[PDB]
Design a protein around this ligand. Structure first.
Ligand SMILES: C[C@H](c1cccc2ccccc12)N(C)Cc1c[nH]c2ccccc12
Ligand SMILES: [Cl-]
Ligand SMILES: [Zn+2]
Length: 314
């Protein structure tokens, strides 16, 4: 019986030394096994595997605690889905554009590139160590693990078309937004006024207007009575806000926003670009960078810096 030593892991933090039989498959010895994202379940050990780290499914109480503490999920499919995405994302290119890590276009990844660019510019702390650790690598120019984790957390596969807003709402569930707070007042000429308070993810995201200034002054929404009412922002406590609406032609003014999602196409099929406000306006389209003093284009998300806002409307 010939053997080598390898490490198995669910997290790549806690390594578990294993003596492996070179006459059995990894699958026979460990269950589903991954080597740098590749499924080696049905492969027999090779001498070059000595001292390498293999991922395995949590098949005992030790591994399940380690996996839960790292990923903050008990979904047994998660590790498998992360490894299948990572097997493709480790082959993408991560261009440095304007001091930011982007992604060269591939497998409809424009929505992921736009989310990655946005996450480098808004103030957000991820709760799971997996996302904290992979985000740090993405900043250092190696975003493959971060992109594969986003796909696993959102239950999306490489190649699937995606929406930036939907992606940010899933990721924001894993971010520490617990103390974010939004107070709204809605004024109806029939029904009167209604003040509500939102906490967490709901406190930082709004669907129906791109303009943070217009949200502060009043937006028109349908009341339950069938009239139009006026909704406005009374108080905001958060490090950023995300304002979204169905794609429409919109003017981004230098200095008035952090970054924005441009979307061209239709609900089914389309392309995201990323607009950021530095000393001038930059349009990041994967690896491609164009700059202008002005922008007009089909915008669907705008991100704004915030700390504490209280309306002066009495
Ligand atoms: C920006 C876009 C979108 C957002 C909101 C309203 C829209 C109205 C008309 C056309 C596009 C619209 N996403 C990508 C479409 C989209 C939403 N969820 C998805 C899931 C998978 C693929 C695309 C999508
Ligand atoms: Cl973080
Ligand atoms: Zn009403």
């Amino acid at each position: 019986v010939r053997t080598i030593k390898v490490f198995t892991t669910v997290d790549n933090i806690n390594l578990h030394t294993q003596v492996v039989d070179m006459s059995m498959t990894y699958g026979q010895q460990f269950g589903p096994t991954y080597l740098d994202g590749a499924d080696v379940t049905k492969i027999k050990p090779h001498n070059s595997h000595e001292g390498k780290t293999f991922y395995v499914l949590p098949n005992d109480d030790t591994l399940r605690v380690e996996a839960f503490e790292y990923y903050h999920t008990t979904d047994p499919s998660f590790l498998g889905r992360y490894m299948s995405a990572l097997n493709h994302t480790k082959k993408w290119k991560y261009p440095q554009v304007n001091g930011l890590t982007s992604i060269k276009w591939a497998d409809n990844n424009c929505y992921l590139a736009t989310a990655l660019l946005t996450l480098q510019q808004i103030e957000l702390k991820f709760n799971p160590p997996a996302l904290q650790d992979a985000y740090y690598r993405a900043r250092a120019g190696e975003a493959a693990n971060f992109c594969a984790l986003i796909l696993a957390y959102c239950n999306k596969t490489v190649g699937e078309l995606g929406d930036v807003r939907e992606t940010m709402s899933y990721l924001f569930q894993h971010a520490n937004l617990d103390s974010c707070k939004r107070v709204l007042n809605v004024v109806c000429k029939t029904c009167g006024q209604q003040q509500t308070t939102l906490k967490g993810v709901e406190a930082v995201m709004y669907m129906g207007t791109l303009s943070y200034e217009q949200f502060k002054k009043g937006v028109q929404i349908p009341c339950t009575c069938g009239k139009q009412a006026t909704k406005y922002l009374v108080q905001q406590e958060s490090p950023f806000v995300m304002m979204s609406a169905p794609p429409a032609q919109y003017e981004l003014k230098h200095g008035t926003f952090t970054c924005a999602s441009e979307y061209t196409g239709n609900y089914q099929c389309g392309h995201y670009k990323h607009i950021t406000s530095k000393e001038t306006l930059y349009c990041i389209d994967g690896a491609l960078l164009t700059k202008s003093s002005e922008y007009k284009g089909p915008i669907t998300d705008v991100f704004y810096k915030e700390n504490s806002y209280t309306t002066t409307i009495k």
